[PDB]
Amino acid sequence: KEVVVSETPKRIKGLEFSALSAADIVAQSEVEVSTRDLFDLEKDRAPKANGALDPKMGVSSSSLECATCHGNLASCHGHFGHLKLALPVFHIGYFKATIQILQGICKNCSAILLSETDKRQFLHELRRPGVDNLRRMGILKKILDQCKKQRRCLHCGALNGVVKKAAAALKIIHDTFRWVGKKSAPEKDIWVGEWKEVLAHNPELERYVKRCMDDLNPLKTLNLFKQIKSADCELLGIDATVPSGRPETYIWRYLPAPPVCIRPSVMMQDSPASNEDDLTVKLTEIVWTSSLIKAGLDKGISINNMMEHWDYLQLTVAMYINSDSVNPGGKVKPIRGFCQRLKGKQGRFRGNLSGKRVDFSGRTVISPDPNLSIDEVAVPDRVAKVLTYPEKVTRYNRHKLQELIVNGPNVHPGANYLLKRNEDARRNLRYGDRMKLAKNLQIGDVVERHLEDGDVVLFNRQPSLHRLSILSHYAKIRPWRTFRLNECVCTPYNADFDGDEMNLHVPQTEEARAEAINLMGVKNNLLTPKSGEPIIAATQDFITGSYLISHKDSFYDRATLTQLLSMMS
């Protein structure tokens, strides 16, 4: 009973990139999608059960507990779901790199068109220890140029042309009758022999619609990417010892659906119900097309209508990512998914990972005050009531954080919250007993006191050109509600007391508070880094008062001198 458990606080090293195989999409398969999915807002006062959103893929509200993570919007992580679709479809991101596999191999035997000596001559340069990414691009371009000029195959008896796009929609229209044109091929002979039989039945396209070779649709190249190799697909650039490095996982066969943590609900304008995400509307749209393309095998409707439905499928799922297509004037392209919420100026790498909104802050208009020390900012007595520092109690705090916890959240040398030793929750001092609660006060409580004089606190100016726009210097509790500081430290901020307001962040842990003042404070950063000149120094009323004491004729008595030396210090 109660066996030994021991856990090591491990790091996070490396980030191995791969693609999800169809077996891995159906591994994270808590739900099964693409049966009806027009059910997510159903008749019985709108719950959901096996639709586009489920109570097995999380919670989109405060009530309605999830059936896998028994929690809510602040407890559930998220759950994926596979969406099986017939007649597979090109990946819109793996569409330029699909050619680089498919142009460098044959089209009948599907083997790589490359001599056996050049294989070792390329692997000796590619598997060298110490190959840069630029060197890898150079070698993978060097093998790419060689496999575009060999007009025939190696061990199949087949000719190969150039492979390009259709016109710029998401089709691969290539040719093979390009390199040899006079003693062309026996394939040319069987091509013109199986063309004379056609024109005795439909002479409409005898000369205009003749020069068009073939398509290379995803229904065929999925059965051709499976053929390719097992040992010579590393020359194409893909590692072949992890079981997801096969080139047929780059085509949509199974489709993962995102959780409801990705797709939230919608606020006011409550004339409809809780409105769906654009991802919800786009995900419930391809279910109808995937069921329409599947039921039409044993039903009837002809090859042109089924081709139009499959084209609508391949154009609707390729607009689910990056929305790089027209809509056959609704809005600003009317569709955002997975790249438009990741493109810069509103995305994740730009607007949620690098630059993010942070609590324990505040901004107010700046005003001048020369009577501060130069390492002292002066915050008002109401910002300090709502800016709070965790000061845990240990044997020097205990006699001070006990007279302070009876003082109250309203009186300024006081505290707002109090975290206990067992960390059940955070007790409010506004509603608590605050006399019996103030007496015990164990030595691990994380009672959070107001901001007082002597606290390390950052101070930022938003157009931060160089490193001296964010500085940290000590606090001071003052009257009327505006930030105020000296005027010698006013030139790196490029402040002019015009009405320009600046924001102010506080540290919360000891490890960052003890370095915010030590190598980032004002008194250490008196210079600039770019020149070595002192950047915080004289201002306008600093040298014009210093000049009028020294113009060879300011002669002072005893009584004026003692008053000057008294007002100075």
Partner: protein
């Protein structure tokens, strides 16, 4: 140091950076992630751009080392094996 006079912009940055998420935040954030999983890039995280995305300590400035607390172990407590089973009983 790379070898050629190259730029700083979105094609001049990709000369040295094997870090993907650093390249997937500079420009063309879509195309750098689809190309890295195609080529099966390893991306050992050591740069300070990819270090605050995953939320851990950098390797520059303060985090360029670590501090170690002393133990004050004498050579008479632990270095002689205080074993009462000197003979197999």
């Amino acid at each position: 140091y790379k070898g050629e006079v190259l730029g700083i912009t979105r094609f001049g940055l990709s000369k040295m950076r094997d870090s993907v998420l650093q390249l997937a935040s500079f420009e063309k954030t879509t195309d750098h992630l689809f190309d890295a999983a195609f080529y099966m890039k390893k991306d050992a995280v050591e740069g300070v751009s990819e270090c605050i995305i995953l939320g851990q300590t950098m390797s520059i400035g303060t985090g360029s080392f670590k501090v170690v607390k002393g133990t004050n172990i004498s050579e008479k407590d632990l270095v002689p094996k205080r074993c009462l089973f000197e003979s197999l009983s």
